Amino acid sequence: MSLNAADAADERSRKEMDRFQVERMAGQGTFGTVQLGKEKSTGMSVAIKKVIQDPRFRNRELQIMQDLAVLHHPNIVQLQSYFYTLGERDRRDIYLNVVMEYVPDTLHRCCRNYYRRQVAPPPILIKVFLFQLIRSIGCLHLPSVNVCHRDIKPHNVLVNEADGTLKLCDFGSAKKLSPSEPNVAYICSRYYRAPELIFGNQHYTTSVDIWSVGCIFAEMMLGEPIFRGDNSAGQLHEIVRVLGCPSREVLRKLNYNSKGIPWSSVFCDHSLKDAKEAYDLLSALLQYLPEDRMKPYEALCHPYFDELHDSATKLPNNKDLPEDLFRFLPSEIEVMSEAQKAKLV
Ligand SMILES: OCCCNc1cc(-c2ccnc(Nc3cccc(Cl)c3)n2)ccn1
């Protein structure tokens, strides 16, 4: 199961590779490949990702992963190792490999497993997942971290359904934004792209990641992406078809006249006991104007999450909620408002 020393691109890389055994392929695709392995020293399960870097774009996977590894946040993957390997199909290619703790599934597959059985995922799972996903972007967006992920989607939100845990991963597109500096607008997967990105703004803020998270909340409750456009213009049309056309002043700030569709009509879920609360939260995430979207630490205090504070609340398999849900890092606690601290800590 040892990694092949001959594939190492250099001595540092051979030494890092000797730390890990490979067990099996977990998944593969345009991003490259992810193997399940094990750290030999600890027995710990790791995900070994061979990174394919598109040279039309700046890839910051390694540098952001190294910045975030200082924090050890419970809802962000933690870098264990990085090394370079020679290509298998052509040994002149060299690839970055990043090693992090293994998470068994993607949010995409976990949700698709329910919908392929004609049922929405259990409401308590959608809720603990959303809580942890909002926590991950709260941490990213702290003034001391200031990372905009820019590509949050159900394929890079990882989950362990059995314990209700969630981790954000895939920082190749992430960047520290500045109101004074420009960025590529064609970033993000189309269905998750915020209105300000659709309009081609080169200056934007971390609120783009709040929009993506709102999109994902809706997707967990619907079974498909909520805003499925065929292109930049189609994307804006699908958003307005669902949300309602925004005022002319809103559209001029970002740069048909739809009434929009009530959430109750979109999701067709009359069993969800706290739907009014869920849909209030979703509307607060999906504000057209970035400055109007509910900020993560405040969203964590939203009444939708109240039952996550009760010890009697269990996951669908009768397991306790994750122990780290309300374990916040000092860098988070120290910038909370008194009300957020009272509620969450
Ligand atoms: O589409 C899945 C995410 C691919 N990108 C990715 C994935 C990871 C990552 C980290 C930890 N555990 C896993 N598990 C896992 C499980 C099934 C399939 C696949 Cl492929 C992976 N993946 C990190 C950065 N980037």
DSSP string, 180-230: TS---SS-S-GGG--HHHHTT-S---THHHHHHHHHHHHHHHHSS-SS--S
Q: What are phi and psi of 134, to 5 degrees?
A: -65, -40
Check pocket membership of 31 for ligand 1, CB cut-off 6 A.
Answer: yes
Distance linking the first and last C-alpha atoms of the chain:
44
Distance (Å, whole) CA 286 – CA 29: 30
Q: CA dihedral in degrees (120, 153, 228, 33; nearest 10)?
A: -100
Q: What are phi and psi of 245, to 5 degrees?
A: -75, 135
* DSSP-derived 3-state class of residue 17: helix
Distance (Å, whole) CA 5 – CA 292: 53
| Domain range summary for the chain, segments of one domain joined by + | 21-101, 105-344
**Which residue, 300, 262, 267, 266, is CA-closest to 281?**
300
CATH 1.10.510.10 assigned to domain 105-344? The reply is yes
Check pocket membership of 325 for ligand 1, CB cut-off 6 A.
Answer: no
Ligand 1 atom at minimum distance from 28 CA: 20
**Which residue, 223, 313, 239, is CA-closest to 274?**
313
Residue nearest to atom 20 of ligand 1 (CA): 27
Q: How many A from CA of 282 to the centre of ligand 1? A: 26
Distance (Å, whole) CA 166 – CA 137: 12
Q: Distance between alpha carbon 321 and the CA centroid of its chain, in Å?
A: 20
Distance (Å, whole) CA 322 – CA 132: 10
Distance (Å, whole) CA 239 – CA 233: 10
205 close to 177: Cβ distance less than 8 angstroms: yes
Catalytic residues: 151
DSSP β-bridge partners for residue 49: 34, 98
86 close to 9: Cβ distance less than 8 angstroms: yes
Residue nearest to atom 3 of ligand 1 (CA): 156
**Which residue, 98, 67, 56, is CA-closest to 80?**
98
Distance (Å, whole) CA 132 – CA 164: 10
Q: How many A from CA of 139 to the centre of ligand 1? A: 20
Superfamily for domain range 21-101 = Phosphorylase Kinase; domain 1 (3.30.200.20)
Tokens, residue 8: 């190492």
Q: What is the resolution of this structure in A?
A: 1.7
